[PDB]
A paper describes a structure:
P. falciparum also exports a single heat-shock 70 kDa-class protein chaperone, PfHsp70-x, to the host cell. Hsp70-class chaperones play key roles across the kingdoms of life in protein quality control, protein translocation, folding and assembly of complexes, and preventing protein aggregation. The Hsp70 structure comprises an N-terminal nucleotide-binding domain (NBD) and a C-terminal substrate-binding domain (SBD) subdivided into twisted β-sandwich (SBDβ) and α-helical lid (SBDα) parts; the NBD and SBD temporarily associate as part of the catalytic cycle, which also includes the opening and closing of the SBDβ/SBDα subdomains to trap the unfolded substrate at their interface.
SBDα consists of five α-helices, which first cape SBDβ and are then arranged into a C-terminal antiparallel three-helical bundle. The contact between the SBDβ and SBDα subdomains showed that our crystallographic structure corresponds to the closed state of this substrate-binding module.
Numbering used by the authors:
A (entry chain D): 433 to 444, 451 to 537, 540 to 645
B (entry chain H): 4 to 7
Write the structure that this text describes.
Amino acid sequence: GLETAGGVMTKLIPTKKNQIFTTYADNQPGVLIQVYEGERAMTKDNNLLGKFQLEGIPPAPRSVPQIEVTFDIDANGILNVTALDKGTGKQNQITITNDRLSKDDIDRMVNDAEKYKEEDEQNKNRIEARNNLENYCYNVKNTLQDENLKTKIPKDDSEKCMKTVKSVLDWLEKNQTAETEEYNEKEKDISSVYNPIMTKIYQGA
Amino acid sequence: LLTG
């Protein structure tokens, strides 16, 4: 597989496969493809085989660009990874030759995955919480300032919520890595202010 | 999501 946002291992005999990915940040000019292989779910734990970066990505919002990464493996085992921009049609590729791990080193790696990947699943869940809140902050801010039509929301409630979101964004920058509960606590604290506004919008009948 |  390859590395996704938050150093996460996203897994992709003869077989060919593809997956669609987007940009982590707004007006991202390029995407770096990092190839990690191994039984353990974490990218960091797995050995990096090669890294290549696509460039010339058109400026666009965080989730808008569509990138297709196709991994082709034949009976020989030679890995051909190609990243293609759906919009532009611009692509980049690398080839990793099958010509050195030993049978017991592979079996040891597989055994390590069973024993340690249990703890990996917990780590993965913790990382996902970071991404979810990040996205939640962006979406709430966008909703409050998004629709010019959605100005109907009371000024007092909007001001109060905007400040809460702003405080969590600053907290997120300062605390690069935090506990799952801390992220959920922050999500819930924003959710506590925002949900009543939403109910009130649809409350009117 | 993919990083730069």
